[PDB]
Amino acid sequence: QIRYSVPEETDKGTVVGNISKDLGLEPRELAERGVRIVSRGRSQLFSLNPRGGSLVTAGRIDREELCAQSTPCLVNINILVEEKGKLFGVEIEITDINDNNPKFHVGDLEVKINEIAAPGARYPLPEAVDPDVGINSLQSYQLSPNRHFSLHLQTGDDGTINPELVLERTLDREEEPTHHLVLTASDGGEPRRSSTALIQITVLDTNDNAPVFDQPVYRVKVLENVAPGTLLLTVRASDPDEGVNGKVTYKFRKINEKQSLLFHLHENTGEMTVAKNLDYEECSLYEMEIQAEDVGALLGRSKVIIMVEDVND
Ligand SMILES: *[C@H]1O[C@H](CO)[C@@H](O)[C@H](O)[C@@H]1O
Ligand SMILES: *[C@H]1O[C@H](CO)[C@@H](O)[C@H](O)[C@@H]1O
Ligand SMILES: [Ca+2]
Ligand SMILES: [Ca+2]
Ligand SMILES: [Ca+2]
Ligand SMILES: [Ca+2]
Ligand SMILES: [Ca+2]
Ligand SMILES: [Ca+2]
Ligand SMILES: [Ca+2]
């Protein structure tokens, strides 16, 4: 019939309730009337103090290991007055305290997101478990300020929380490849508890940058009697894409139908040099079309105007 209560994580010899008064006895008589505890299970976590006629704690008491998720933490014990032959039921409540903040299961999480991803996409975030329940349980999720994302606290009829990261501004690894965000799980206590997990956004690459030359039109003036193999020009095209998507290949547009090449444009480094003596060819003005190509078959087109200056006259 009796109901007591006691805070958790308390010490040994801590009062639970004035049992001598509710038992119809007197303090000194507690040892005299031969009343003891019938220790069945968790009832062993308590002991009787016959000196002051009280029920006291005799071991470590923590709701997390005893009750945890259950809203009421109750321990029902049976106390027997033998001489009177009377039995009594004692229900004991346990107060939850804040000694267990919301802790994540991972200290970090990497989210691989491609640039091509349009706003509206969503990627799951870690969750922190709260051993304590109530106000001393997980209360909020805070996300460090960014420009491309937003913390969506999803909640269904299930009851629990689902923190998902929503993209609302397109990413671009050609500008910024990685991002570092902070996921703070907070708890309402005194002071407010909290833990944090790291969120690394790894922006994967897509081939969206087409090759683009340094100049629409390349211009060079060289004497006809210049030695073959002379470095006329160093052609270059830009492609900020990652690795294979950034590999640029330079070549003449009409390279396939040509017979004897007058100039050699290197496939990789794009170095344009003299192949044959320009004097014998007797050409005074060249206007050649060149192109640059990546593995995505994206083209860049440019021109090169070679003015050949005659010597002997
Ligand atoms: C998480 O947030 C709390 C405030 O809610 C801090 O007290 C704690 O140190 C951690 O930064
Ligand atoms: C949680 O987040 C904080 C940033 O507020 C980190 O400094 C900490 O190491 C933990 O990952
Ligand atoms: Ca506790
Ligand atoms: Ca607790
Ligand atoms: Ca807590
Ligand atoms: Ca891009
Ligand atoms: Ca790219
Ligand atoms: Ca490219
Ligand atoms: Ca000549």
Oligomer, anyone?
A: monomer
Query: How is the main sheet built?
Result: 4 strands, mixed
Shape verdict: rod-shaped
Tell me the number of structural domains.
3
Query: Strand-and-helix sequence, N→C?
Result: EEHHEEEHEEEEEEEEEEEEEEEEEEHEE
* Widest sheet, order of strands: 1-7-6-3
Q: Count helical runs.
A: 4
CATH homologous superfamily annotation of the largest domain: Cadherins
CATH A-level architecture of the largest domain:
Sandwich
CATH class of the largest domain: Mainly Beta
Structural class: mainly beta
According to CATH, the fold-level topology of the largest domain is: Immunoglobulin-like
Report the portion of residues in β strands.
35-45%
Number of strands: 25
Question: Topology, pairings included?
Answer:
Blueprint: E1 2-7, E2 15-17, H1 19-22, H2 29-32, E3 35-38, E4 46-49, E5 54-57, H3 63-66, E6 74-81, E7 86-95, E8 103-104, E9 108-114, E10 122-124, E11 128-129, E12 138-143, E13 149-154, E14 162-167, E15 178-187, E16 193-204, E17 212-213, E18 217-223, E19 231-234, E20 237-238, E21 249-252, E22 263-265, E23 271-274, H4 278-281, E24 285-293, E25 299-309
Parallel strand pairs: 1-7, 9-16, 18-25
Antiparallel strand pairs: 2-5, 3-6, 4-5, 6-7, 8-11, 10-14, 12-15, 13-14, 15-16, 17-20, 19-23, 21-24, 22-23, 24-25
